[PDB]
Amino acid sequence: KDLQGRLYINRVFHISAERMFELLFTSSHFMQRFANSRNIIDVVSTPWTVESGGNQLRTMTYTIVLSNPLTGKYTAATEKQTLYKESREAQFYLVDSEVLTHDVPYHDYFYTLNRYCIVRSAKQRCRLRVSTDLKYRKQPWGLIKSLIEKNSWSSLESYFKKLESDLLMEE
Ligand SMILES: O=C1[C@H](CC[C@H](O)c2ccc(F)cc2)[C@@H](c2ccc(O)cc2)N1c1ccc(F)cc1
Ligand SMILES: [Cl-]
C-alpha cells in the first residue's frame, strides 16, 4: 500500500495508533509547534467530517515561508485529507493527503500525494509509514520536470526527517 514515488518514514514509535493520528491529523499542540518550526503560517483547518460512504474528510489552507528565493518568498497551499473507512475497519489508519501550491513557479503543473499509514503494534506502539507520489497535471517538458523534482524531493526529505525527529519527543 506504499506509494511508489518515495518512502520517507518507516518507523515504530512508542505512541499508540490513535494518539499518532491525533498528533498528526488534528489541531494538536504538536502540530502548532511543528508548524512554527517548519515556517508554516496562517493555518486554517476544518475538523474531520464523515461522508455517507464512511470515509472522513479534512481540508486545510496555509502559507509556506520558502527558503529558496527562486521559488518565491511565500506560497499559499491547500490540502485535502482523506481517512479511508476500509483501513479503520481493519484496525489501522490510512490517510491520503493531497497538497497543492498556488504561487511557486510551475505551481499549476503538479501536486503531491502523501500517504500516511499508521498500524498497531504490541504494547501501545505503532508503525508510521509515509510515502509520497509527485503527480503531474500538465506535461512537465524538459527542465520543468527536473526543477519540480529536485526542489520537491529535497524539501520533503527535510520535512519528514524533522517530523520523525519531532514525533520521537512525544513518546
Ligand atoms: O507534504 C507536505 C507538507 C505538509 C504540511 C502539513 O500538512 C502541515 C503541517 C503543519 C500545519 F500547521 C499545517 C499543515 C508540506 C510542506 C510544508 C513546509 C515545508 O517546508 C515542506 C513541506 N508539503 C508540501 C507538499 C507539496 C508542495 F508542493 C509543497 C508543500
Ligand atoms: Cl482501531
Side-chain angles (χ1 to χ4, degrees):
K1 281 166 190 143
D2 282 356
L3 295 176
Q4 300 273 53
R6 182 145 167 196
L7 176 70
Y8 277 112
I9 298 174
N10 176 19
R11 178 153 200 170
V12 174
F13 291 88
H14 190 19
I15 301 172
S16 71
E18 63 275 13
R19 187 154 84 81
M20 200 36 105
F21 183 82
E22 188 181 271
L23 287 166
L24 296 175
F25 289 107
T26 70
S27 301
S28 57
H29 273 32
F30 175 83
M31 287 294 302
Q32 163 213 111
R33 291 193 303 275
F34 188 71
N36 182 48
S37 298
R38 305 289 74 81
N39 242 351
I40 294 166
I41 66 171
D42 193 20
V43 182
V44 183
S45 61
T46 71
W48 286 97
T49 53
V50 180
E51 313 189 313
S52 57
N55 288 349
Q56 307 196 24
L57 170 69
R58 177 165 181 257
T59 55
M60 317 175 81
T61 59
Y62 50 90
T63 290
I64 302 167
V65 181
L66 298 158
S67 54
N68 174 348
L70 297 196
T71 67
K73 197 190 226 183
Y74 303 105
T75 185
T78 304
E79 291 202 17
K80 186 225 318 208
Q81 309 176 337
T82 302
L83 172 67
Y84 294 103
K85 176 71 145 43
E86 166 172 311
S87 70
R88 295 295 308 117
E89 291 187 46
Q91 300 200 98
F92 73 108
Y93 294 79
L94 191 66
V95 177
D96 275 348
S97 179
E98 294 182 329
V99 180
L100 210 29
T101 68
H102 302 297
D103 302 302
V104 302
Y106 307 115
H107 62 265
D108 40 325
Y109 278 72
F110 72 98
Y111 70 101
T112 304
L113 173 66
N114 299 308
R115 176 166 287 183
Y116 296 71
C117 185
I118 304 165
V119 179
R120 298 180 177 284
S121 187
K123 281 159 154 223
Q124 296 330 105
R125 292 182 193 134
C126 72
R127 178 183 300 281
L128 175 64
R129 298 178 79 89
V130 185
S131 56
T132 300
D133 280 332
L134 198 46
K135 302 261 164 202
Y136 291 100
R137 308 172 57 187
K138 298 184 172 175
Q139 182 66 35
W141 296 106
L143 183 60
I144 299 176
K145 186 180 175 252
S146 307
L147 292 173
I148 288 172
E149 287 206 284
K150 148 166 190 333
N151 298 188
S152 295
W153 290 135
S154 73
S155 178
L156 290 176
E157 187 176 82
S158 176
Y159 176 88
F160 287 122
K161 279 191 172 15
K162 275 310 280 193
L163 185 67
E164 177 174 327
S165 185
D166 284 354
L167 283 168
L168 288 171
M169 312 232 67
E170 303 293 321
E171 294 189 323

